[PDB]
Amino acid sequence: AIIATAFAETVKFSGSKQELQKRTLALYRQFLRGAPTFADLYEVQFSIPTIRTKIRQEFERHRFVDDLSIQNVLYAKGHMEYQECINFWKQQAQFLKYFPEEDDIQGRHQPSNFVDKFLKNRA
Amino acid sequence: VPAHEIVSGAPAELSRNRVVRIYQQAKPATQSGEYGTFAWRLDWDIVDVANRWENDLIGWQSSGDYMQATQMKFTSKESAIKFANKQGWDFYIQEPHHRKFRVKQYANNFVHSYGKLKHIRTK
Amino acid sequence: MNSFENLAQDVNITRSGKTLIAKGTGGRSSRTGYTATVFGANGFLGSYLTAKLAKHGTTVVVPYREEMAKRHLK
Amino acid sequence: KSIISYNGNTIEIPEEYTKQAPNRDSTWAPAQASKTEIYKNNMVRFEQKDLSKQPMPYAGIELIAQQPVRFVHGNTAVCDGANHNGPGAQGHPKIFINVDAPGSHACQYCGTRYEKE
Amino acid sequence: MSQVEPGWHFWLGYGVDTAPCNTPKEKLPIRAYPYKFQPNYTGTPGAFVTYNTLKPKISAWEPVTKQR
Amino acid sequence: ALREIRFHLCQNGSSSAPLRQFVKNQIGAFQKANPSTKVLVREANGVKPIVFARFDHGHESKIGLDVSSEKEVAERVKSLIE
Amino acid sequence: EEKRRVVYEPLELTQAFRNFSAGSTAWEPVGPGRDDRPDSFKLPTPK
Amino acid sequence: AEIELTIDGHKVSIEAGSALIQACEKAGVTVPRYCYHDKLAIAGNCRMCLVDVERAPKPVASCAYPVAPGMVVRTDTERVKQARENVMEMMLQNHPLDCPVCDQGGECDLQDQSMRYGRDRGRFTEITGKRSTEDKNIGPLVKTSMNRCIHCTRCVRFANDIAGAPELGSSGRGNDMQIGTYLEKNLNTELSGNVIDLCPVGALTNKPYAFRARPWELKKTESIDVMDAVGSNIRIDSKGVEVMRVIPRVHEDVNEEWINDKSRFACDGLKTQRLTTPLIRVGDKFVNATWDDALSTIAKAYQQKAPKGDEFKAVAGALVEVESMVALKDMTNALGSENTTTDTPNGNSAPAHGITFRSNYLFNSSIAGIEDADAILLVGTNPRREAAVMNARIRKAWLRQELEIASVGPTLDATFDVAELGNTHADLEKALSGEFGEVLKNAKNPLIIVGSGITDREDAGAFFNTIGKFVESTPSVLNENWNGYNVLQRSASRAGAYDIGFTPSDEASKTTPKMVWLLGADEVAASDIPADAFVVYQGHNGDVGAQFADVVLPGAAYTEKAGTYVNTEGRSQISRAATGPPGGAREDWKILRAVSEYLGVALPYEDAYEVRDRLAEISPSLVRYDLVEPTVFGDVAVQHSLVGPNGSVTPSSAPLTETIENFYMTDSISRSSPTMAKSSIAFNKDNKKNQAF
Amino acid sequence: GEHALRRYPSGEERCIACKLCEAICPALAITIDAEERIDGSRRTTKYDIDMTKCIYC
Numbered sequence A: 001a002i003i004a005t006a007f008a009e010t011v012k013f014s015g016s017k018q019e020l021q022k023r024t025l026a027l028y029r030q031f032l033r034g035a036p037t038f039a040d041l042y043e044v045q046f047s048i049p050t051i052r053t054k055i056r057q058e059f060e061r062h063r064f065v066d067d068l069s070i071q072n073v074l075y076a077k078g079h080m081e082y083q084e085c086i087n088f089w090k091q092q093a094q095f096l097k098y099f100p101e102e103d104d105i106q107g108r109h110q111p112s113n114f115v116d117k118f119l120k121n122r123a
Numbered sequence B: 001v002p003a004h005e006i007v008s009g010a011p012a013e014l015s016r017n018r019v020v021r022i023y024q025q026a027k028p029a030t031q032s033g034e035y036g037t038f039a040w041r042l043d044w045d046i047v048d049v050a051n052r053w054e055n056d057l058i059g060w061q062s063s064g065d066y067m068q069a070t071q072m073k074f075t076s077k078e079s080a081i082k083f084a085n086k087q088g089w090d091f092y093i094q095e096p097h098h099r100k101f102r103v104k105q106y107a108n109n110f111v112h113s114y115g116k117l118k119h120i121r122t123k
Numbered sequence C: 001m002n003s004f005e006n007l008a009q010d011v012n013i014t015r016s017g018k019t020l021i022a023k024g025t026g027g028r029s030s031r032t033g034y035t036a037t038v039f040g041a042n043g044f045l046g047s048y049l050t051a052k053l054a055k056h057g058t059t060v061v062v063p064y065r066e067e068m069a070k071r072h073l074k
Numbered sequence D: 001k002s003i004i005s006y007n008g009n010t011i012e013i014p015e016e017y018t019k020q021a022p023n024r025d026s027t028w029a030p031a032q033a034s035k036t037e038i039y040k041n042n043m044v045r046f047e048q049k050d051l052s053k054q055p056m057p058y059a060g061i062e063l064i065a066q067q068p069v070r071f072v073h074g075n076t077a078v079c080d081g082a083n084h085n086g087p088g089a090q091g092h093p094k095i096f097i098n099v100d101a102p103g104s105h106a107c108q109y110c111g112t113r114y115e116k117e
Numbered sequence E: 001m002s003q004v005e006p007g008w009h010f011w012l013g014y015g016v017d018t019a020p021c022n023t024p025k026e027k028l029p030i031r032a033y034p035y036k037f038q039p040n041y042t043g044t045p046g047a048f049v050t051y052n053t054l055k056p057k058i059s060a061w062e063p064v065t066k067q068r
Numbered sequence F: 001a002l003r004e005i006r007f008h009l010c011q012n013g014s015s016s017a018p019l020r021q022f023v024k025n026q027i028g029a030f031q032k033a034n035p036s037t038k039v040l041v042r043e044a045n046g047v048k049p050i051v052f053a054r055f056d057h058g059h060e061s062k063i064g065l066d067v068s069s070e071k072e073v074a075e076r077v078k079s080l081i082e
Numbered sequence G: 001e002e003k004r005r006v007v008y009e010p011l012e013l014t015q016a017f018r019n020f021s022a023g024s025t026a027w028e029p030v031g032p033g034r035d036d037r038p039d040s041f042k043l044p045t046p047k
Numbered sequence H: 001a002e003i004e005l006t007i008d009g010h011k012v013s014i015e016a017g018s019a020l021i022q023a024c025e026k027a028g029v030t031v032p033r034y035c036y037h038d039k040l041a042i043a044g045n046c047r048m049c050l051v052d053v054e055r056a057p058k059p060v061a062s063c064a065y066p067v068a069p070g071m072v073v074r075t076d077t078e079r080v081k082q083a084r085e086n087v088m089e090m091m092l093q094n095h096p097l098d099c100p101v102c103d104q105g106g107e108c109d110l111q112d113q114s115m116r117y118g119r120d121r122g123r124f125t126e127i128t129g130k131r132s133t134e135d136k137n138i139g140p141l142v143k144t145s146m147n148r149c150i151h152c153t154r155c156v157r158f159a160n161d162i163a164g165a166p167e168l169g170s171s172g173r174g175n176d177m178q179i180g181t182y183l184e185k186n187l188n189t190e191l192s193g194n195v196i197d198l199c200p201v202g203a204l205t206n207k208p209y210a211f212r213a214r215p216w217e218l219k220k221t222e223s224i225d226v227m228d229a230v231g232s233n234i235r236i237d238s239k240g241v242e243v244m245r246v247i248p249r250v251h252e253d254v255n256e257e258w259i260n261d262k263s264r265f266a267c268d269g270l271k272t273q274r275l276t277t278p279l280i281r282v283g284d285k286f287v288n289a290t291w292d293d294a295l296s297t298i299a300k301a302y303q304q305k306a307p308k309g310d311e312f313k314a315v316a317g318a319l320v321e322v323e324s325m326v327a328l329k330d331m332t333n334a335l336g337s338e339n340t341t342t343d344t345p346n347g348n349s350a351p352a353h354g355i356t357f358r359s360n361y362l363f364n365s366s367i368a369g370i371e372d373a374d375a376i377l378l379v380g381t382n383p384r385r386e387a388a389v390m391n392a393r394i395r396k397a398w399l400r401q402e403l404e405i406a407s408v409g410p411t412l413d414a415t416f417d418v419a420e421l422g423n424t425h426a427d428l429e430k431a432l433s434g435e436f437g438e439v440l441k442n443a444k445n446p447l448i449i450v451g452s453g454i455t456d457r458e459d460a461g462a463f464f465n466t467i468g469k470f471v472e473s474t475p476s477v478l479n480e481n482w483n484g485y486n487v488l489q490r491s492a493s494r495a496g497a498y499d500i501g502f503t504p505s506d507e508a509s510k511t512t513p514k515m516v517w518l519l520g521a522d523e524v525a526a527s528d529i530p531a532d533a534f535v536v537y538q539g540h541n542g543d544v545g546a547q548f549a550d551v552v553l554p555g556a557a558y559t560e561k562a563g564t565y566v567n568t569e570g571r572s573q574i575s576r577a578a579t580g581p582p583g584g585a586r587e588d589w590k591i592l593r594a595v596s597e598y599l600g601v602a603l604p605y606e607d608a609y610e611v612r613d614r615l616a617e618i619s620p621s622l623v624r625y626d627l628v629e630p631t632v633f634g635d636v637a638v639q640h641s642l643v644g645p646n647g648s649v650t651p652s653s654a655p656l657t658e659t660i661e662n663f664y665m666t667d668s669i670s671r672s673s674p675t676m677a678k679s680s681i682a683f684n685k686d687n688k689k690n691q692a693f
Numbered sequence I: 001g002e003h004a005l006r007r008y009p010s011g012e013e014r015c016i017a018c019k020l021c022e023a024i025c026p027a028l029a030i031t032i033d034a035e036e037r038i039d040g041s042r043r044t045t046k047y048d049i050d051m052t053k054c055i056y057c
């Protein structure tokens, strides 16, 4: 038959927000635990704490989503991303998409006020 | 109104700093056919810096706006508004204009004039 | 969207009286309007400098001695 | 010959390569860039290059101006630009040109000029 | 292979039975310009330099001051 | 005000009736009382009665004229002018 | 080259995509067609 | 009353006496047509619109057949299909094989209806070939290719009935019938370009536009014309960075589906003489400069100059949008100045009709109000130049109902009969006390149309006094169902300028400025600028003010921004940006925001939403788009603004003169247009091409 | 194989800038610009083919 792969979870839409909260915290634990494996697979310059910080920021972004269906989709996609990272299916190039700040300073001029944005036609 | 923005995978700038227009195509002044005027188009307003510029090698028109050629079709103004809200898009509705009806009679070309003719109709 | 992180403004005047208008957002298809010659561009420092310049679409003229050695710059 | 650049330096170009075509000195359309402007705006990519090898097609406007007017008896000349030697349909769509007005009248497709007589 | 003149190029690929020197006059092209054959100049100072045949679509104002 | 006064009011709204009366009857009195101010009256359907005043160097202040009488309209106006 | 890796960036096109669907016909092209329903699957008319 | 008929089985109810094609359109049935058009007299010459009617034995022309109760019509019979094929066969037999070279290709009703209703192949292989036709020269705007003409007579009906230009017609007979002027005459009318839209085929085409684009490659944007104050709704067709052409779209309450020739052909002024980089005067020459350099130079000139109060003068030109005017006024007020002026003569002083109520400077009868007119008095106004499509509207009303029109002012070449009452204010006094005053008293829908050019006179109050007294008397002219008092603005920005109160204070008109900011202001003279003054010009074209300037700032044109414009009606309309601005030019309100930050007085909105907010703060009607609402204050306004303050004004003895010398060049864009210059020479009155006798 | 633009036997260009090639091109490889030639002819001022976009169909 056609069997599932490493760290594959069948898609199940949780009927309750608490039963989803359990699964979500388990996924967060999985990510935090895989951080050192990630740093080894993807030959990263930065530290393991930086990876774990990034993971926290990712999970933080959806801290206030209310609709159960949306949380279900966010969870299923987050698990897909975990499976992609832990199996080394990603290359370094796509993994480093998650760490834009880790790259060096892009230049002297990142405008913040109106006048600087207006001088670069970005007002 | 479900915030499907956060599940689509589109860039955040699309639901933050872009405006769309929802309208019906006007009856073209060059033709008598009205076949393209019933759909509700949704398309993006242009961005000044990124819209179009001349390439210095061969003269092609470059662009930085990935939405510049995209146009959605909807069967009703309400469907379009619903979709735009579901994507978190700021929109403007341009209400369509229609030809005011009047009665036209061929015989009116020959009505007897009791005083001085205001103009010579020629046919 | 990309940006011209190297440029302070969009219209620039060179000391020689040339008017340069930057076109585009700042990516590969954009042009700053500047033209630069980098002597020794195929070397250790020059390759980084050429990468940074060409990234925002300033025209880079590279004088070279041996052909095969400069190919990566393209 | 000498074209002044935006830098303020001089570009030298042989006279013959400043001609828009070998058979014509000047542009034949308002939007057409002249050779001088092309060199002024693209000189970087012309350095260490041989101009004599670049494509230099003949301007068709002078060539068609060299063709004699065809004189026709009636009010209407017919043109199709056909190739009487080959098979198939090798000309342009067949059109009819009114020659009642004074002077010659050009085929919209091929530029051949007709005149009443 | 780019040094082979057109016509002969077709003949060498068994495109036509009869060779260019044997082709009757009626089946030759009339030219009002001089014919010149040039091979591939790639990797050579004679390589084709492309360019925009249009001047820019928007023309700027030539600045002129006036006295008040 | 010192320089500008703007009256926003509805044309058909009931909440704007005291404002409409105030304009219609005492607009000339107000204009003569403040000869250098620039007074504008602007009407639109959905808007709530309001008055803006512009004093100097662009500083502006506003008060809403959802009121009962013309007397009280002029009271709110005079208060804002102070 | 600075990073020695394949990088992802916001899209920029040397020639913008040209969408020619603006030239679609102003006249309805085909019409209604015909119905091929069998007579045993049409509601009867009274009398 | 409405009667009822059936079309293709459907039930449709339509007003009695309406044509069958109208009922077909109402019932959602498509009927092919060439000669019929909703805005022209019925012709019935193309024969494409045939249908079957059970009473009729042979197929009837739908466009000319009156509907009757109980009528049964079939548009889908085999006879009708056959007739459509027969007519298309006859139409195509002499039509030239021109589609590859014809500008109509791809937006052609002949092509499309051949595809939809005709044979797939022709039968005409005659060895004597086709008929050919001479080409005809009717001026620099409309190129002719008369082989393509299918003799629908739309151009003739439009030129005769709608524009009042009878030089066009059909000569000869039978196969040799030709559309033209029978001898070399220009099609001389400000409405002429509309025939290009009306011609179903490529017989009449846009000459400046020829061969430059095909319809499938054009981005289409619905926007607003700013060549006059009517606010015609338009479609701008652009490709990439440049605007290719301007076409009307339908707004039955504004321009209905027409535009004038300036609105159509001055677009080529947008690709030449453009302002692309900041300029700084150094000696007698401009030098290109950065935005930072130019803004800093403005700031340093402000610090040095040190204007107190009303020494900072702001001037707004004919083309500017409302957001830009609002930002300029807010910055000017934050500088301590009340010297916000308009660009017109005597615009240093306030207008004599006042600014307090909108109904004192607007077309209070809507544009559509002209349809109801029974008597019109024109006072110092030539509508044919000031508002061409409104002039066409007046002509249509005049042609279809009895209506009396009189004017005080310069003799005008009119497309309708006018009664000249004299060129002076004394003539106006006599008229309003005489027979035409009685005409106005007796009428059901009178309106008095006052030109924006009278406002620009010193004696303006006198006129506004006279009219005002008359209006305050005659109930037919001003009552709760009808306001017949009308001011006709000529410039697209004036109504909005008055809306935000872009008007000088009384003490400001005394002062001599040390710093002048011109916002699209190209009507300014040498006299209007002090020599010691530091002049900033902000615009999109280099015409006049830029020549006067010390610092020049490139701003966006109307096709490059989504601006608000208020037309003569008080209608607030919103445009859409087709392209972005060229080079280093900028959206104008952002220019003002940046320069105010350089000046200390940094404005409180840096976003488009915040600017629209601020606009709603100034006037709630600026954000209520495409809406016209009447004033409840109609009686108060006339007394308070026209009759009240204007008693002291003494009338001059100078006659009223024409407001606009040349229709074809009025603003910076039109004066930058090669087409407008060519047309100005071509259509001059002293040229025999423009003279019927 | 490789593209070419042809002439009439007189030497006049055959292309009259109808832009049908540009419309049909499945790869959008053709870019065309036109206007009226100083002799009145309908002719191209720009005809470009991106041979690296072309599919040689």
Ligand SMILES: NC(=O)C1=CN([C@@H]2O[C@H](COP(=O)(O)OP(=O)(O)OC[C@H]3O[C@@H](n4cnc5c(N)ncnc54)[C@H](OP(=O)(O)O)[C@@H]3O)[C@@H](O)[C@H]2O)C=CC1
Binding pocket: C039, C040, C041, C042, C043, C044, C045, C046, C064, C065, C066, C069
């Ligand atoms: N790396 C370091 O630690 C330091 C370097 N520098 C200086 O930085 C500059 C470049 O540094 P780096 O990249 O490391 O050096 P590289 O050797 O890598 O590159 C030097 C460049 O100079 C060219 N060069 C050397 N001689 C000639 C010559 N006769 N004619 C033409 N070109 C020549 C080389 O061209 P080609 O490849 O054809 O030989 C090469 O491209 C040098 O001037 C160096 O002195 C000074 C302080 C620190």
Ligand code: SF4
Binding pocket: H095, H096, H097, H098, H099, H100, H102, H103, H104, H105, H106, H108, H109, H110, H111, H148, H200, H201, H202, H203
């Ligand atoms: S008018 Fe229409 S059918 Fe006739 S040549 Fe032009 S595009 Fe073709």
Ligand code: SF4
Binding pocket: H148, H149, H150, H151, H152, H153, H154, H155, H156, H179, H198, H199, H200, H201, H203, H204
């Ligand atoms: S020129 Fe055009 S509009 Fe006029 S009759 Fe001929 S086809 Fe009709």
Ligand code: SF4
Binding pocket: I014, I015, I016, I017, I018, I019, I020, I021, I022, I032
């Ligand atoms: S534009 Fe293309 S299709 Fe039209 S004539 Fe020229 S080459 Fe042929």
Ligand code: FES
Binding pocket: H032, H033, H034, H035, H036, H043, H044, H045, H046, H047, H048, H049, H050, H061, H062, H063, H064
């Ligand atoms: S549209 Fe009816 S005959 Fe022409």
Ligand SMILES: [Zn+2]
Binding pocket: D079, D080, D081, D092, D107, D108, D109, D110, D111, D112
């Ligand atoms: Zn021909």
